[PDB]
Design goal:
- Helices cover 34% and strands 15% of the residues.
- The two termini are 35 Å apart.
- It is an alpha/beta fold.
- It has one domain.
- Strand 5 (75-80), helix 3 and strand 6 (106-111) form a beta-alpha-beta unit.
- Helix 1 (26-39) crosses helix 2, helix 2 (53-65) crosses helix 3 (87-101) and helix 3 (87-101) crosses helix 4 (139-151).
- The protein binds NADP nicotinamide-adenine-dinucleotide phosphate and the ligand CCOc1ccc2c(c1)C=C(C(=O)NCc1cc(C(=O)O)c(C)o1)CO2.
- The ligand CCOc1ccc2c(c1)C=C(C(=O)NCc1cc(C(=O)O)c(C)o1)CO2 is lined by residues 19, 47, 49, 82, 115, 117, 124, 132, 217, 219, 222, 306, 309.
- NADP nicotinamide-adenine-dinucleotide phosphate is lined by residues 17-19, 45, 112, 161-162, 185, 211-217, 231, 246, 248, 263-268, 271, 274-275, 301.
Length: 315
């Protein structure tokens, strides 16, 4: 299953999440992306930030050489990192991603976050006090540079990530806008279900793409250990038992049935293959209402030290 995007292109509704923390060897991204393609994933989510585009690209090339897939069967996403928001840096950042992945185009290029950072090669530029250094950029000019990347055929589609409604409206209301964002990739799961943003996006034909849909990797660097564990939720577990599925499968199917495209990261061969079973069963309307009741406005990626950024999305 795919969803038609507002530029006429198609996006598979289940995508494979590729982020792994730096303690994971980069050889693993190569191995698990091949396994995901073998399992049936066709939408692969990467980014400059992830330090894995070379390996994800090698996995794609290898499965093309196998004869398993063609390039046109794979939906590959990359993201513009926040130190590259100044408009003259956007196309060179995209070309660099394409060179690492050894691809001629991406299917989707996103602005990774609205929070601009000091330009440079450092992904996390830090001052003498250990504070990450912000930059001020008009994201409408960043967007204009993304539009030129689509016109050049380097990205089939363009979208955003981590935007709130006012940030989306800033793009949608931009004078001389040529391409709307096809999607907004945001944190979305039963403890933070984004119903308000989803209704807004639906009204603008913008696809919401859920990340941390299984509750995040709970990295101690960015997630409070005392936050509740999504997949231990009693309602999700009771529904998994009723359906003879797993809590992860319930969480993924929840998104599919409300019109959300869903990502799922796993570096485990058996859970990768399990997640493709989201297409094998259905939740009832009563099940959906019970999951809708779980929202607690819980942000695993709260970016607490960045709350003072002018573009922090949760203001
Ligand atoms: N645009 C952004 O700012 C942004 C931010 C966050 C994430 N993302 C994208 O979204 C992807 C997914 O989000 P995420 O990394 O936070 O992780 P997630 O999809 O919420 O998954 C969290 C953990 O679930 C476990 N898992 C997967 N399938 C499972 C299953 N069937 N049963 C039990 N546990 C399961 C995985 O562990 P195992 O690996 O051990 O299986 C994974 O570490 C990311 O990789 C990235 O591609 C983007
Ligand atoms: C206003 C400053 O902005 C910055 C600057 C530097 C940063 C961050 C934010 C945040 C980082 C971070 O959250 N890494 C963990 C992670 C990222 C993703 C993803 O998929 O996008 C996943 C699943 O985990 C890296 O260092």
């Amino acid at each position: 299953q795919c969803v038609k995007l507002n530029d006429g292109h198609f996006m598979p509704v289940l995508g494979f999440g590729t982020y792994a923390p730096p303690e994971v060897p980069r050889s693993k991204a190569l191995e698990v992306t091949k396994l995901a393609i073998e399992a049936g994933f066709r939408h692969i989510d990467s980014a400059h930030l992830y330090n894995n585009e070379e390996q994800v690209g090698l996995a794609i090339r290898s499965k093309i050489a196998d004869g398993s897939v063609k390039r046109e069967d794979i939906f590959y996403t990359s993201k513009l990192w926040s130190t590259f928001h100044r408009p003259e840096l956007v196309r060179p950042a995209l070309e660099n991603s394409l060179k690492k992945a050894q691809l001629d185009y991406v299917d989707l290029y996103l602005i990774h976050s609205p929070m601009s950072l000091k330009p440079g090669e450092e992904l996390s530029p830090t001052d003498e006090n250990g504070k990450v250094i912000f930059d001020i950029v008009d994201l409408c000019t960043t967007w204009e540079a993304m539009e030129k990347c689509k016109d050049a055929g380097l990205a089939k589609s363009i979208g955003v990530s981590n935007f709130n409604r006012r940030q989306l409206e800033m793009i949608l209301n931009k004078p001389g806008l040529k391409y709307k964002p096809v999607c907004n990739q945001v944190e979305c799961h039963p403890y933070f279900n984004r119903s308000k943003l989803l209704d807004f996006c639906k009204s603008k034909d913008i696809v919401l793409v859920a990340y941390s849909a299984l509750g995040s990797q709970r990295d101690k660097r960015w997630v409070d250990p005392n936050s509740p564990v999504l997949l231990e939720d009693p309602v999700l577990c009771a529904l998994a038992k009723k359906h003879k599925r797993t809590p992860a499968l319930i969480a993924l199917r929840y998104q599919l049935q409300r019109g959300v495209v869903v990502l799922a990261k796993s570096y485990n061969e058996q859970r990768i293959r399990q997640n493709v079973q989201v297409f094998e069963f259905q939740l009832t309307a009563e099940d959906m209402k019970a999951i809708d009741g779980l929202d607690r406005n819980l942000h695993y990626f709260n970016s607490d030290s960045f709350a003072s950024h002018p573009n922090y999305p949760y203001s």
